[PDB]
Amino acid sequence: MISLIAALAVDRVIGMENAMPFNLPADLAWFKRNTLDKPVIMGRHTWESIGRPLPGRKNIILSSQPGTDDRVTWVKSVDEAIAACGDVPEIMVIGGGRVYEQFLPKAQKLYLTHIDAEVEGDTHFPDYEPDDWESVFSEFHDADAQNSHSYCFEILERR
Amino acid sequence: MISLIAALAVDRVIGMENAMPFNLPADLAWFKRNTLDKPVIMGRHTWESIGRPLPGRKNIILSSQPGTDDRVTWVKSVDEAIAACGDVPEIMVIGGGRVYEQFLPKAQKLYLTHIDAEVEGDTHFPDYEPDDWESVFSEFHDADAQNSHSYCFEILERR
Ligand SMILES: CN(Cc1cnc2nc(N)nc(N)c2n1)c1ccc(C(=O)N[C@@H](CCC(=O)O)C(=O)O)cc1
Ligand SMILES: CN(Cc1cnc2nc(N)nc(N)c2n1)c1ccc(C(=O)N[C@@H](CCC(=O)O)C(=O)O)cc1
Ligand SMILES: [Ca+2]
Ligand SMILES: [Cl-]
Ligand SMILES: [Cl-]
């Protein structure tokens, strides 16, 4: 099963290349807990923003360009990405934009972080009709000394 | 000598009610490089914000209240804070507002990180007379894949 995991600001805006103007360690922890011990698929800009292989996860980079680094797996197509994953219960797609567009149709689950921040931006997480998806978990959190903005974690199941 | 090290947004904002919305690892790396192996003096709110003792430095907390952590040194006066640093060439004051106000008069150098961001602030860096300070180093950088805003490092020496 394929799942997409993303942190969205108001209007579904997501990052493009530069880091997003928010500071949410709670969301990085959530991100870690849900992707650890699973394969993760990401595009080239996400890989540069991360800056190193995520430990405890098989790192698959989907891109047209060449593999700089030998520590990760570089694939040129969606099909190739999937295969690199092997037979596992759940595959995590971690962005960016175009990557989410390509895998959404195949997605059965969504782990989203709705952040209360207005950011100006070009990219948006793909439009999804929440009535083709069932909201199974929702938990709100206020901003605090460590987290810059309020945020809400949500898991959706493809109905 | 005593030096003050701070990150200031536009209008000299140094803090907000919650965590600042900047994701700036380069500023934390400039912060570590300039404070490593030196004693650091901070207020209680900054201490609670960091979360742990900073590695490789002598952590001194200036507070009227009683200490809650055995790994650091708790002091109640500026005079006490200084004495606790001993005989070192340079003592670093890392915030927040009130602590900076108390130590400014005694500081000979400022290491500042100007961040290009407009925010509503809670606390601000004290007003300094740009005429009493000599900029001896400046370095601008744009936002990038890992840094959310553009910023500029500057070191000033009292004239
Ligand atoms: C820029 N980027 C991609 C990123 C960031 N937040 C997201 N948050 C969510 N919810 N979803 C994503 N797909 C997402 N992706 C990053 C950057 C750093 C780390 C990171 O360092 N993660 C550590 C945890 C925090 C740490 O070690 O400093 C980990 O083990 O996953 C993860 C993703
Ligand atoms: C909230 N806080 C206070 C903070 C943050 N940025 C500042 N930036 C500047 N330039 N000056 C300050 N006084 C400043 N203070 C922090 C928070 C974290 C760390 C911190 O973990 N720094 C690590 C380096 C970063 C890392 O290894 O993740 C260190 O070793 O100094 C420091 C100060
Ligand atoms: Ca100069
Ligand atoms: Cl990407
Ligand atoms: Cl403080």
Side-chain angles (χ1 to χ4, degrees), chain A residues 1-67 69-75 77-105 107-128 130 132-158, chain B residues 1-128 130 132-159:
Chain A
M1 135 211 64
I2 290 180
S3 311
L4 278 40
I5 179 165
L8 323 188
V10 341
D11 298 349
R12 324 192 324 304
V13 172
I14 62 176
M16 194 160 64
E17 163 156 320
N18 296 157
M20 291 293 272
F22 59 57
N23 184 24
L24 304 178
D27 174 72
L28 287 187
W30 164 257
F31 175 82
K32 181 170 173 171
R33 170 190 358 149
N34 284 303
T35 52
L36 205 67
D37 300 316
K38 294 180 199 177
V40 284
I41 295 169
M42 78 193 84
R44 172 114 54 172
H45 288 110
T46 295
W47 163 242
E48 316 263 39
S49 285
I50 302 172
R52 40 148 196 174
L54 294 160
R57 285 147 278 191
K58 182 169 186 188
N59 297 230
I60 298 158
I61 317 327
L62 208 179
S63 163
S64 264
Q65 321 292 121
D69 207 300
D70 74 282
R71 302 173 291 171
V72 306
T73 294
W74 298 87
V75 299
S77 91
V78 163
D79 267 8
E80 230 141 305
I82 287 142
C85 286
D87 228 85
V88 296
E90 180 169 32
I91 297 182
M92 300 299 298
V93 176
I94 67 159
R98 296 268 323 98
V99 175
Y100 287 138
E101 284 161 10
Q102 292 164 85
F103 279 90
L104 220 216
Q108 173 167 145
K109 208 169 187 197
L110 298 177
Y111 303 68
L112 303 181
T113 300
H114 299 285
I115 298 148
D116 303 307
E118 326 203 20
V119 161
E120 330 162 331
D122 283 296
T123 325
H124 298 266
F125 180 82
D127 182 290
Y128 61 99
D132 243 7
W133 288 99
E134 176 168 62
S135 152
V136 132
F137 171 80
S138 166
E139 178 192 79
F140 179 88
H141 298 262
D142 272 301
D144 65 19
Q146 263 81 31
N147 296 280
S148 64
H149 294 79
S150 279
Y151 48 100
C152 192
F153 297 128
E154 172 172 58
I155 292 169
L156 300 98
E157 300 193 1
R158 198 175 224 144
Chain B
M1 119 201 96
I2 289 171
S3 297
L4 281 36
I5 173 165
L8 273 58
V10 167
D11 290 347
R12 294 187 281 126
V13 175
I14 53 166
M16 291 175 76
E17 282 186 25
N18 302 301
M20 315 264 263
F22 309 140
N23 180 350
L24 303 174
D27 174 68
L28 285 180
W30 158 260
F31 173 89
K32 180 173 165 178
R33 164 194 289 281
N34 288 295
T35 56
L36 205 57
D37 309 313
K38 287 167 203 189
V40 295
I41 291 178
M42 61 199 90
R44 194 186 281 260
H45 303 276
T46 290
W47 158 249
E48 282 173 12
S49 285
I50 295 157
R52 37 131 197 198
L54 283 168
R57 278 151 281 194
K58 169 154 212 228
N59 297 238
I60 300 169
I61 303 2
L62 173 58
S63 182
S64 258
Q65 296 79 90
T68 81
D69 201 283
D70 291 320
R71 314 168 276 179
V72 302
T73 296
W74 302 80
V75 300
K76 295 234 202 180
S77 68
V78 167
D79 287 356
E80 260 172 68
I82 294 181
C85 294
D87 270 72
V88 304
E90 180 187 23
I91 289 168
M92 304 300 288
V93 177
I94 65 163
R98 283 284 294 137
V99 171
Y100 291 131
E101 292 191 32
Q102 300 178 86
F103 282 88
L104 188 60
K106 313 179 102 76
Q108 282 324 295
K109 185 169 207 184
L110 302 190
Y111 294 73
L112 299 182
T113 302
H114 304 281
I115 296 162
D116 184 17
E118 281 217 317
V119 293
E120 206 187 14
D122 168 31
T123 52
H124 294 260
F125 192 78
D127 214 348
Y128 53 104
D132 305 352
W133 298 88
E134 180 183 353
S135 177
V136 290
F137 172 83
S138 73
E139 191 177 279
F140 185 73
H141 300 268
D142 283 332
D144 67 24
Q146 292 189 135
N147 297 274
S148 67
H149 285 84
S150 73
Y151 44 100
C152 174
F153 294 132
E154 175 169 55
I155 293 175
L156 309 126
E157 289 183 353
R158 200 187 265 288
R159 281 180 199 278

